[PDB]
Design a protein around this ligand. Structure first.
Ligand SMILES: CC(C)[C@@H](NC(=O)[C@H](CS)NC(=O)CCC[C@H](N)C(=O)O)S(=O)(=O)O
Ligand SMILES: [Fe+3]
Length: 330
C-alpha cells in the first residue's frame, strides 16, 4: 500500500522567451518527454516574482471580512449575483468546507467589451473588493494576470514545437483581448479540529480535499506554497508530486488531449488532505470563445485525425459545469 513519487522534471523554460531556435527545440523535447510520461513538469527560470504573488495573496486571504465575502460571492453562494458564475469569492463553510478562493478573469472584460454586451456565456466583468480596505490588491492581481499570461504564451510555444508544429500553433489563439483564462487564489486553511465532513475518502483509502479530475484548460500553469499535496494517476496507481514553491507546475488540460488525439493526455490528478495552511494559485490557460484548433494525431504518418474541431467556449462551458457536478461546488 506504499505510495511512489512521480517523476516531475524541472525544465529551464527561459529559451522560450528568446530567439535561439535550437535551444527552444531542446526545451520542446523536454516538454514532449514529460507530456508523454506523467504529464507534469516544473517550469523553472520563468522570470515571475512568485514571492510577491504569495505575499499579496496571503495578505488578501487573511484580511477579508464575512461582509466583503458576501458582497463578492459568486451566485452559488449569493442569489443576488446571478451574473457571477465564474468570477468572485468562493466561500468556505466552517465545519463543512475548508477551502475558499477568489477567481477573476480577463481584465479586458469590461462593459465596453462586445462579449459582455452580447452576454456570451463564460464572459464576466471581474468584481473587486474595496480599494481602501485592500490597498494595491486589484493592481497586483491584474498585473499578475498579464505576468503569467506572458509565461503561458512562451510555454505554449514549447508545446507547439514539441508536437512538430510552428511555435505559434497554440499561442495565436491566446490573446489579451478575448482569452477566457482565469486566475484562482485558493486558500487551504489549517484547522484544529479539522472537520471530517470536509475530508473525502478515495477508493484506495487516501484522504482527499478534492477528488480525481482532468483539468478544464488547454494547459494549467500553477503556483503553490511548499506543502506537498498533489498526486497524479498512473497505471500503477497514484504517485506523489513533490512540492516546489519556486517553480510553476505545468500540465495539460482536456482540450489538449482532445486536439492531439490523446497523444498528450490530460493527467488525472487529485489533492490529498493535508492539515496545513497553504495556497494554490492556478492560471487556467483558456483560448477565445470562438477559438478552434483542428485536431491531429502525431502517431500517424499523415498526422490525420477524425476528431471534430471543438469550439473552446462550448468546451469551457461544458467542462466547468461537469467538474462542479462531479467533484462538487468549490
Ligand atoms: C477545489 C479547488 C481548491 C481545486 N482547484 C481548482 O482550481 C480545481 C481543480 S484544477 N478547478 C476548478 O475548480 C475550476 C475553476 C474554474 C474557474 N472558476 C473559472 O471560471 O475559470 S484543488 O485542485 O486545488 O483542490
Ligand atoms: Fe487540477
Amino acid at each position: 500500500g506504499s505510495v511512489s513519487k512521480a517523476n516531475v522534471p524541472k525544465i529551464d523554460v527561459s529559451p522560450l522567451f528568446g530567439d535561439d531556435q535550437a535551444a527552444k527545440m531542446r526545451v520542446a523535447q523536454q516538454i514532449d518527454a514529460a507530456s508523454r510520461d506523467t504529464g507534469f513538469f516544473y517550469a523553472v527560470n520563468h522570470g515571475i516574482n512568485v514571492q510577491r504573488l504569495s505575499q499579496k495573496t496571503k495578505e488578501f486571504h487573511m484580511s477579508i471580512t464575512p461582509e466583503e465575502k458576501w458582497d463578492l460571492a459568486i451566485r452559488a453562494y449569493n442569489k443576488e449575483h446571478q451574473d457571477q458564475v465564474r468570477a468572485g469569492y468562493y466561500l468556505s463553510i466552517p465545519g463543512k468546507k475548508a477551502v475558499e478562493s477568489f477567481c477573476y478573469l480577463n481584465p479586458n472584460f469590461t462593459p465596453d467589451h462586445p462579449r459582455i454586451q452580447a452576454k456570451t456565456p463564460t464572459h464576466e466583468v471581474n468584481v473587486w473588493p474595496d480599494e481602501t480596505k485592500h490597498p494595491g490588491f486589484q493592481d497586483f492581481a491584474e498585473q499578475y494576470y498579464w505576468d503569467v499570461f506572458g509565461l503561458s504564451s512562451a510555454l505554449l510555444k514549447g508545446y507547439a514545437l514539441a508536437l512538430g508544429k510552428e511555435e505559434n500553433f497554440f499561442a495565436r489563439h491566446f490573446k489579451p483581448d478575448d482569452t477566457l483564462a482565469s486566475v484562482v487564489l485558493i486558500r487551504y486553511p489549517y484547522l484544529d479540529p479539522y472537520p471530517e465532513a470536509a475530508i473525502k475518502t478515495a477508493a484506495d483509502g487516501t484522504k482527499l480535499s478534492f477528488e480525481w479530475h482532468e483539468d478544464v484548460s488547454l494547459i494549467t500553469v500553477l503556483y503553490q506554497s511548499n506543502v506537498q499535496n498533489l498526486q497524479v494517476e498512473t497505471a500503477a496507481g497514484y504517485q506523489d508530486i513533490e512540492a516546489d514553491d519556486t517553480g510553476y507546475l505545468i500540465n495539460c488540460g482536456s482540450y489538449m488531449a482532445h486536439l492531439t488525439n490523446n497523444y498528450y493526455k490530460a493527467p488525472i490528478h487529485r489533492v490529498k488532505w493535508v492539515n496545513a495552511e497553504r495556497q494554490s494559485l492556478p492560471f487556467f490557460v483558456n483560448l477565445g470563445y470562438d477559438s478552434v484548433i483542428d485536431p491531429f494525431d502525431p502517431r500517424e504518418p499523415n498526422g490525420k485525425s477524425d476528431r471534430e474541431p471543438l469550439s473552446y467556449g462550448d468546451y469551457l462551458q461544458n467542462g466547468l459545469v461537469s467538474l462542479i457536478n462531479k467533484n462538487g461546488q468549490t
